[PDB]
Design a protein around this ligand. Sequence first.
Ligand SMILES: Nc1ncnc2c1ncn2[C@@H]1O[C@H](COP(=O)(O)OP(=O)(O)OP(=O)(O)O)[C@@H](O)[C@H]1O
Ligand SMILES: Nc1ncnc2c1ncn2[C@@H]1O[C@H](COP(=O)(O)OP(=O)(O)OP(=O)(O)O)[C@@H](O)[C@H]1O
Ligand SMILES: Nc1ncnc2c1ncn2[C@@H]1O[C@H](COP(=O)(O)OP(=O)(O)OP(=O)(O)O)[C@@H](O)[C@H]1O
Ligand SMILES: [K+]
Ligand SMILES: [K+]
Ligand SMILES: [K+]
Ligand SMILES: [Mg+2]
Ligand SMILES: [Mg+2]
Ligand SMILES: [Mg+2]
Lengths: 187, 187, 187
Amino acid sequence: VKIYTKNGDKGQTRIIGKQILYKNDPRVAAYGEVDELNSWVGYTKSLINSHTQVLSNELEEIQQLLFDCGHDLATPADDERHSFKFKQEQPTVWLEEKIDNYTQVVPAVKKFILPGGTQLASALHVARTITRRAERQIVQLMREEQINQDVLIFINRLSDYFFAAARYANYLEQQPDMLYRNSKDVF
Amino acid sequence: VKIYTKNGDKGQTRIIGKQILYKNDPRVAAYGEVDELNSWVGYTKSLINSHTQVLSNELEEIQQLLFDCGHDLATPADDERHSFKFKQEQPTVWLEEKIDNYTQVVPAVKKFILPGGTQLASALHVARTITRRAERQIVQLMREEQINQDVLIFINRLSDYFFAAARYANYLEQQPDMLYRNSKDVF
Amino acid sequence: VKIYTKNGDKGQTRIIGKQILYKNDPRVAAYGEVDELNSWVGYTKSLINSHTQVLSNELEEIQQLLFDCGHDLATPADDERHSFKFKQEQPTVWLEEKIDNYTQVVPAVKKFILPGGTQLASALHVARTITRRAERQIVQLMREEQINQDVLIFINRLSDYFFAAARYANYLEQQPDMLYRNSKDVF
Ligand SMILES: Nc1ncnc2c1ncn2[C@@H]1O[C@H](COP(=O)(O)OP(=O)(O)OP(=O)(O)O)[C@@H](O)[C@H]1O
Ligand SMILES: Nc1ncnc2c1ncn2[C@@H]1O[C@H](COP(=O)(O)OP(=O)(O)OP(=O)(O)O)[C@@H](O)[C@H]1O
Ligand SMILES: Nc1ncnc2c1ncn2[C@@H]1O[C@H](COP(=O)(O)OP(=O)(O)OP(=O)(O)O)[C@@H](O)[C@H]1O
Ligand SMILES: [K+]
Ligand SMILES: [K+]
Ligand SMILES: [K+]
Ligand SMILES: [Mg+2]
Ligand SMILES: [Mg+2]
Ligand SMILES: [Mg+2]
């Protein structure tokens, strides 16, 4: 069992189906960024402590879902042998319910908050911004190729989820958020 | 209060003023990278311990300043209703004074150092390299559109600040820097 | 000794040799991404504990090697005064021996694993994905300019190394890997 094949040593790689692409191809960058986000979520999850245990399982669930998203990003729309498996509806409503809940419980802001606080809150804000980076790359891809737009919907909602969860993480250890001192009332 | 509007679900988003852009637009990537840096700084700050307390407040101040920078990056130069608010002079001199101080106190190198050491030092080196990534994206933007060049000046100086601060973090816990074994005398 | 020269304040910077480039030039992005990876490895190394001590020295060695790689990425192929110093053969075989060893010791999977587990394992998966991001940028560069292809070979192998090491980190604290629930038998 050798995970190193050396077939990518020249800069090309396989996607789902028969096609090979350069590794800097927008498709390969898109699910590559999703994989980096997925790894960061894993890292975020490893920071869970006794105060924040309630967040542990949904972070693991998000990791499962990112694999589902990345599958589809790796799959060309005109591939006869492989289909899109990701449906946005239920995973996205599930995120929305959490955003709603977490928004309700934490103290309300007007203004932008400093992305920080506890180590977990801060990690969740990093997740937020990696998701948004990945989102940009999915959009780059979408502008050149037919994608499963359900993936975009979910990844879009996901960075709102990370924002909500990060505030909730602060709430769980009673760490106050700090406001951006020059913020207008934006929320 | 719903932070999810679903208006970005198709890949376009508002900037400051009336314009909408794709999320992979260089402008949106520029202040997006600044937001990721801002989140990383928050994460860096959450690692502060009893040895490194003296670094806590200026990291928070940097977060405030990154919001100021990102405002301007989000603002088109020809927007009649919105202006640039960021002036580089005082924030940049403030960084320079810190670079000078931290450079003076820590042991002097000739050679490149391994970016690492304590967890905070290492986090500061990550901040250094995220700032430089963000800087590249600001430059990408500048090559297509008129920006506030003060933002570039500050973000440029900021990665030197992170280099200096990271060495200082090592000094604060008396963790020696390690040299790149094949370095020429570069400093 | 001032690390801030202010020469980059306008968005251009020197590479090895006489040439200046914009900071968003693919060459500058390539060794820039390598520097970010290098910093992340430093951060990964700072997480080493009593269970995972055996990983400490090779992470430091990787940092040395990334400087060697970045040197060459910074060096134009037609630069009369500066040469490529990086040879892939021995560093790459060294990675392969570790991949082989670590693959042998850890429990075998069929299926994709969730990138996560212990804090070090998870950090190693982040390293994995930053290496792959950097790899894409090296490929971007290669498609425009002559590079030392040895660097590509090594950086390619390196993300397999990080995958193997991350599983090994889990093994060292007896943290089980979790499987992607919808995985096909991919390994
Ligand atoms: N640098 C990269 N960034 C993002 N995705 C990648 C990268 N390289 C490969 N991939 C994708 O992820 C899968 C696994 O990567 P892997 O390293 O096994 O591919 P490879 O580099 O082509 O092969 P090898 O490393 O064995 O030479 C690939 O089949 C490809 O779809
Ligand atoms: N992926 C992204 N990366 C960087 N910046 C973004 C991204 N998406 C939106 N932005 C910018 O940051 C602001 C907030 O993002 P937000 O998610 O609220 O926007 P949206 O995606 O357009 O809306 P929604 O998520 O409600 O559908 C936006 O108005 C836009 O300027
Ligand atoms: N944003 C960046 N991203 C990646 N690499 C960079 C960046 N800026 C400079 N470099 C490269 O790394 C070296 C060190 O960066 P440094 O900040 O010293 O350069 P500079 O910005 O041109 O100068 P200064 O900061 O003194 O105005 C440079 O000579 C250049 O090759
Ligand atoms: K491989
Ligand atoms: K939103
Ligand atoms: K400098
Ligand atoms: Mg959004
Ligand atoms: Mg600079
Ligand atoms: Mg590979």
